[PDB]
Amino acid sequence: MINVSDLTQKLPEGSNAGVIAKNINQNQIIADYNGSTFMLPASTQKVFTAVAAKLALGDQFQFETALLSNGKIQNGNLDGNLIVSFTGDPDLTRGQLYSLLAELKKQGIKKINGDLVLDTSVFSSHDRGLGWIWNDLTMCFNSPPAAANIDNNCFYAELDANKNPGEIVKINVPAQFPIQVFGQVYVADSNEAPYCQLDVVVHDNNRYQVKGCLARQYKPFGLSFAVQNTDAYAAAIIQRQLRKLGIEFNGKVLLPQKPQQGQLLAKHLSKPLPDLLKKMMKKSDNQIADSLFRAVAFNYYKRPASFQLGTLAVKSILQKQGIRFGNSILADGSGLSRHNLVAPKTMLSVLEYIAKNEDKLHLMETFPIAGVDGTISGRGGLISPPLVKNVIAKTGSLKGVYNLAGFMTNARGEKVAFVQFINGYSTGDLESKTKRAPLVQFERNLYNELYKY
Amino acid sequence: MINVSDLTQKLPEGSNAGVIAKNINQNQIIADYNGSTFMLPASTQKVFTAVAAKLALGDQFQFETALLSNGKIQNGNLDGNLIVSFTGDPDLTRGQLYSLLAELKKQGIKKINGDLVLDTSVFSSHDRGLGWIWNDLTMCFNSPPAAANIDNNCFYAELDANKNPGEIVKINVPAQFPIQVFGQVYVADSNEAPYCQLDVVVHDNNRYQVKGCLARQYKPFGLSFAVQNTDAYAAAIIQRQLRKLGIEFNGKVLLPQKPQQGQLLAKHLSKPLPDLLKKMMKKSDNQIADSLFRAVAFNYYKRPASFQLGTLAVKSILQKQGIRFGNSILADGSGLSRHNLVAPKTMLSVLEYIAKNEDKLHLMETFPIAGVDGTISGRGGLISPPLVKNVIAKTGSLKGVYNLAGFMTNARGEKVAFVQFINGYSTGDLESKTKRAPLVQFERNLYNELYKY
Ligand SMILES: *C(=O)[C@@H](NC(=O)[C@H](NN1CCNC1=O)c1ccccc1)[C@@H]1N[C@@H](C(=O)O)C(C)(C)S1
Ligand SMILES: *C(=O)[C@@H](NC(=O)[C@H](NN1CCNC1=O)c1ccccc1)[C@@H]1N[C@@H](C(=O)O)C(C)(C)S1
């Protein structure tokens, strides 16, 4: 087998690597280094989720976002409640919700007499994975994959810190977001600056307090925040859009937390599963993975889905297809949780299942292609012949974690499936910029070995 | 050396072990297995914190909680604000705070004309380490090591779950706690019960939303919770206490972040560093570990202390003594963070420094003793000769991690220092207490072999 142990000498000291690879044509394992050790899969976990969604939702699955009413339209009045049903669509934009509500106008409604009622009942318990880290939860990459999701549950604010030391940074939030950012951040001199922390503290109802300080900035300083209360935000968006559509509403916003019945007035459909999967796999969209992860459980078990149910469903579905998980911990669909534990060989058996059932699943074309698209279009170790346009691979990255899982063609034309997990990769301070040169070398060498073996 | 490899076969499949041990007398490494791999040290991290505290704070160090004012007493009146100074004392009781406020009365203050002002400026930024897990923040083990800390920053509620399936559990907050618990928990029948989560969501001003279910319990019981907003909690307690004391107060609560200059009116001192350290090391008190961690930074750098500053301070101080960290990540003092990355051989070097410098530091007596005290009084693998009353060791535990770091005497009366890091331990999932039997066996055999070598 490949001596992976020599190859890891290029990785920073203290890191650990799990590598396993199989020549599918020969059915030979050609690299096996820590192949049974549990490690953190990061976003390569999405491979499990792609397969469970294909099997249990199918290619016609679309998320639905719907308007319903318990009462009747007469004389331009909806005489009853506007029920807006959200089921986790991770790709719903503000524009798409606006056009959906517009459909009320076409049906002649110019006034709602009752209350606005959100049904978000398809998802339950928290909208975040267990073992997620607390202090990223305000960042856009980590937005909550909740039943109600508008513009990725993320908004942008601008901090004007182009001012002298001692001045208060100016916070600018575009008027379209119904949230509030407040607080007193100050500009610090070159002496104080290295000691600054720019913090945000989350308060009820989507109020954000920025505190702390930063160095004078010489461009505008973006802050890209995750919406924290997704029902309240969606309800406030809906009210402003009704107003702008000219539909009169003066009732309350109700969040009853169980399914709501009424007559279907209008349904917006997301793009279908193969489109969602392509985007989740090429670009590694976290919210699409955790949305699908719970949609899978909702549909499989026919009950409100928590992350716990999503875990149970994905395992049971894959186990029926012959995958064995032993004591693996899959706490989420995106792999963000620091509690996930999976051995390279388990990921590998799903990758072989993927290659073997390609005529039914069509998941091959979803993998990023080296030097061509997705998250490895510019991946340093992979961008030269004979790897470029050959390796395709799902990536995963967290602080300290750099993983690949995918396929390639070797020098004899045979297909190789492989899994690379690297954990404990550290090249400086907790806050400083990670150096990828040791990663680039290691990956260039390993995939070259796999090519030539 | 000892064949640790053979020993790690009794550990559960997928787990990963890092083990290193040095015969101090012979200056010889006698076990070296993944000794250079970064792993999660859990609460063995507190060894680093103990040493930094000894060195930079010293045996005379005590946390001060203080009352000051800028007004003068006159007619039983305090003609200005009462400033209450909190500096992170992790061992402050509600009784102690009361006795401190009593001093206001011994001095004849009848009422305070002004506002209540809390000075917490010695700590800075968040009171939670980076890379701590969000869903545990409500547990008492994980209560915030904030500046203001009263009775471990922990409370309980009374629950009554002796009801039938479908019925609501009764949750009453005891009168002494200024906290709300809201929402509701139902009793689950024997079916649901296996897969029940009790969810707790934090809202502003120490309001806790509880949701989900519990299994029927015949008898009433208490659940502990971490206080979340510690400033508010503290201030609510101070105001109850001033009433109970008969000191009239009708002003505002103010929470500036800059230190508050004023005339000292009274003060209370915690127990001094050696008692703090012994309780930390013996009982593995996370709050003492994280307060000391930032108290180290505050005194070392003479400026307000974030966890990032604590990291800098602890490394700098141990570096001065010869310890080399390379690219380790020490994100907190308690070892709770999932971002911590330390190799066994680094922890081993600090243990060698501890034993070498015992005459000055007196840390050996802080370690739990096998079969005797602290967290290893009943540790399974250590409770028979020749290990009982011999092995001393700081433990560390998280989901998936079972570590030991400390010393023992071998058959020749030589001292052996050792580090045992086990990660990726899983014999079950996120919803199952894993069996500790393979760990008992591993440890028994490992320490027996280090005994006889
Ligand atoms: C999956 O690996 C996923 N990674 C992240 O989202 C990762 N996020 N973190 C780290 C801790 N909390 C987070 O939200 C991350 C890593 C680096 C930069 C931003 C975010 C996605 N997969 C990655 C990949 O394919 O390599 C990314 C494209 C970076 S995001
Ligand atoms: C150090 O290891 C520390 N461990 C814990 O506090 C640990 N806390 N966790 C686990 C997940 N999030 C947390 O806050 C824990 C583990 C098991 C049971 C309770 C708490 C302290 N040291 C441990 C030890 O010395 O073994 C404990 C005595 C359990 S607490």
**Dihedrals φ, ψ of B97, to 5°?**
-65, -40
Does the beta carbon of A377 sit less than 6 angstroms from any atom of ligand 1? no
Contacts of A3 (CB under 8 A, 6+ apart): none
Q: Counting atoms of ligand 2 from 1, which one is nearest the CA of B132?
A: 12
Resolution number, Å: 2.1
The conformation of residue A305, written as its DSSP 8-state character, comes to B
Residues B450 and B404 reside in one and the same domain: yes
Query: Do A449 and A300 belong to one domain?
Result: yes
Contact B135 A126 (CB under 8 A): yes
**A10: number of Cβ within 10 Å:** 16
Report how far Cα A382 is from the mean position of its chain's Cα atoms.
24
**CA distance from start to end of chain B:** 8
- Give me the amino acid identity at A354: I
Cα separation of B319 and B335, whole Å? 19
Question: Residue B267 corresponds to which tokens in the numbers above?
Answer: 């003060």
Cα–Cα distances (Å) from A381 to A344, A390, A438, B194, in that order, read 20, 13, 10, 47
Separation CA A362–CA A347 (nearest Å): 18
Same-domain status, B152 and B89: no
- The secondary structure of B187-241 as a DSSP string is EEPTTTGGG--EEEEEETTTEEEEEEEEE--SS-EEEEEE-S-HHHHHHHHHHHH
> Which of A221, A251, A270 marks a domain boundary?
A270
Which residue in A423, A198, A126, A338 sits closest to B132, CA to CA?
A: A338
Residue that finishes a domain, picked among A249, A270, A291 = A270
Rg (CA), chain B: 24
Q: Find, among A236, A266, A269, the residue nearest to A253 by Cα.
A: A236
Distance CA A384, CA A86 (A): 45
- Ligand 1: does its nearest atom lie under 6 Å from the Cβ of A395? yes
In 3D, which of A389, A376, A384 has the Cα closest to residue A445? A384
Q: Is A206 exposed, middle or buried (CB count within 10 Å of its CB: 0-12, 13-18, 19+)?
A: buried
Residue of A199, A399, A431 with shortest CB distance to B125: A199
Ligand 2 atom showing the smallest separation from residue B139 Cα: 14
CATH code at A259?
A: 3.50.80.20
| Nearest partner of B377 among B396, B365, B392, judged by Cα | B392
Residue B334 falls in the annotated catalytic set: no
Contacts of B424 in chain A (CB under 8 A): 37-39, 341
Residue A396 CA, ligand 1 centroid: distance in Å: 7
Judged by DSSP in three states, A345 sits in helix
- Reported residue count of chain A is 453
Task: Tell me which residue has tokens 């009752």.
Answer: A114
* Angle, alpha carbons B448-B452-B453 (nearest 5°): 115
User: Do A336 and A290 fall within a single domain?
Assistant: yes
Number of neighbours of residue A28 by Cβ within 10 angstroms: 13
Q: Which of A43, A270, A291, A334 is catalytic?
A: A43
Q: How far is CA B168 from CA A259, B164, B185, B186, in A?
A: 20, 8, 6, 4
Residue B301 belongs to what H/E stretch?
A: helix B286-301
Residues B311, B375 within the same domain? yes
Distance in angstroms (rounded) separating the CA atoms of residues A309 and A297:
6
- Structure-solving method: X-ray
Q: Are residues A326 and A444 in the same domain?
A: yes
Residue A158's H or E segment, with its range, is strand A154-160
Residue of B43, B291, B306, B337 marked active site? B43
| C-beta of residue B213 within 8 angstroms of C-beta of residue B188 | yes
Name the token pair of A82: 């506007």
**Pocket of ligand 1, candidates A40, A43, A287, A434: which has the most ligand atoms within 8 Å of its Cβ, to mutate?**
A43
Q: Closest residue (by CA) to atom 29 of ligand 1? A: A397
**Residues of chain A contacting residue B427, judged by C-beta atoms under 8 Å apart:** 327
Number of compact structural domains in chain A: 3
From A179, A201, A229, the end of a domain falls on A229
Asked if A343's CB is within 8 angstroms of B428's CB, the reply is: no
Residues A198, A77 share a domain: no
Q: Please give the distance, rounded to the nearest whole angstrom, from the Cα atom of residue B334 to the centre of ligand 2.
A: 9
As to burial, measured by CB atoms within 10 angstroms (0-12 exposed, 13-18 middle, 19+ buried), residue B266 is: middle
- For A54, the domain range is 1-62+271-453
Q: Which residues, in sequence order, are CB contacts of A390 under 8 Å at separation 6+? A: A370, A408, A409, A451
- In sequence order, what DSSP letters do the residues of B381-448 get, joined into one string? GGSSTTTTTT-EEEEEEETTEEEEEEEEE-TTS-EEEEEEEEES--SS-TTS----HHHHHHHHHHHH
Distance CA A162, CA A165 (A): 10
DSSP A406-441: EEEE-TTS-EEEEEEEEES---S-SSSPPP-HHHHH
Atom of ligand 1 at shortest distance to CA of A394? Answer: 25
Per annotation, catalytic residue among A270, A284, A334, A349: A284
Q: How far is CA B291 from the centre of its chain?
A: 8
Q: How many residues does chain B have?
A: 453
B448 and B377: one domain?
yes
Nearest residue of A to residue B258, measured between CA atoms: A212
Using CA atoms, how far apart are residues B186 and B214, in angstroms rounded to an integer? Answer: 7
Rounded to the nearest angstrom, the minimum Cα separation between B349 and chain A is 16
A436 CB near ligand 1 (under 6 Å): no
- Residues of B in Cβ contact (< 8 Å) with A34: 16
The pair of structure tokens assigned to A400 is: 């300290």
Cα diameter, chain B = 79
Q: Which ligand is nearest to the CA of B367?
A: 2
B291 catalytic per annotation: no
Rounded CA gap, A386 and A380, in Å?
A: 13
Query: CA-CA distance, B50 to A26, in Å (whole number)?
Result: 56
Give the angle subtended at the CA of B85 by the CAs of B84 and B87, to the nearest 5°: 150
What is the CB < 6 Å shell around ligand 2? B 42-43, 133, 136, 139, 141-142, 284, 286, 335-336, 375, 395-399
Instruction: Copy the structure tokens of residue A330.
Output: 């899959």
Residue B290 DSSP one-character state: H
Give the distance from CA B184 to its chain's centroid: 30
Q: Are residues B324 and B427 in the same domain?
A: yes
Residues B412, B25: Cα–Cα separation, whole Å: 10
CATH number at residue A422: 3.40.710.10
| Distance between B36 CA and the closest CA of chain A, angstroms | 6
Q: A275 and A179, same structural domain?
A: no
Beta-carbon separation of B37 and A400 below 8 A: no
CA of B398 to the centre of ligand 2 (A): 5
Q: In whole angstroms, what is the distance from residue A236 CA to residue B69 CA?
A: 45
**DSSP, residue by residue, A108-134:** T--EE-S-EEEE-TTB-S-SS-TT-BG
Nearest ligand for residue A433 CA: 1
How do strand A186-188 and strand A207-215 relate by DSSP bridges? Answer: parallel
Dihedrals phi, psi of A246, to nearest 5 degrees: 75, 20
Query: Using CB atoms, which residue from A13, A326, A339 is nearest to B430?
Result: A339
A14 with B338: Cβ contact below 8 A: no
- From residue A162, give the alpha-carbon distance in Å to each of A167, A196, B25, B206: 9, 16, 61, 37
Could you tell me if A108 and A34 lie in one domain?
Answer: no
d(CA A323, CA A319): 5
Tokens of B143: 């209560």
Give exposure, A349-370, as e/b (b: 16+ Cβ within 10 Å): bbbbbbbeeeeebebeebbbbb
| Measured distance CA(B304)–CA(B293) in Å, rounded | 12
The whole-angstrom separation of Cα B353 and Cα B321 is: 8
Cβ contacts of B176 within 8 Å, gap of 6 or more: B94
- Quick one: which ligand is closest to A138's CA? 1
- CA distance to A27, A394, A417, B297, per residue, from A349 (Å): 12, 15, 9, 49
* Cβ atoms of A394 and A406 closer than 8 Å: yes
Contact B227, B235 (CB under 8 A): no
Is there a contact between A254 and A117 (Cβ–Cβ < 8 Å)? Answer: yes
Listed in sequence order, the residues at least 6 apart from A202 whose beta carbon sits closer than 8 Å to its beta carbon are A137, A138, A208, A228
Which amino acid, residue A113?
N
Q: Cα torsion for A60, A65, A69, A72, to the nearest 10°?
A: -70
Residues of B in contact with A186 (CB under 8 A): none
The torsion angles phi and psi of B417, rounded to 5 degrees, stand at -105, 145
DSSP SS3 for A30: strand
Measured between CA atoms, how close is A196 to chain B, in angstroms? 9
B394 vs B405: CA distance, rounded Å: 5
Q: Which amino acid type is present at position A270?
A: S
Are A168 and A288 in a shared domain?
Answer: no
A54 is catalytic: no
d(CA A452, CA B149): 62
CB distance A334 to A286 below 8 Å: yes
Q: Which two tokens stand for residue B74?
A: 């006159």
Structure token digits, residue B69: 């004012």
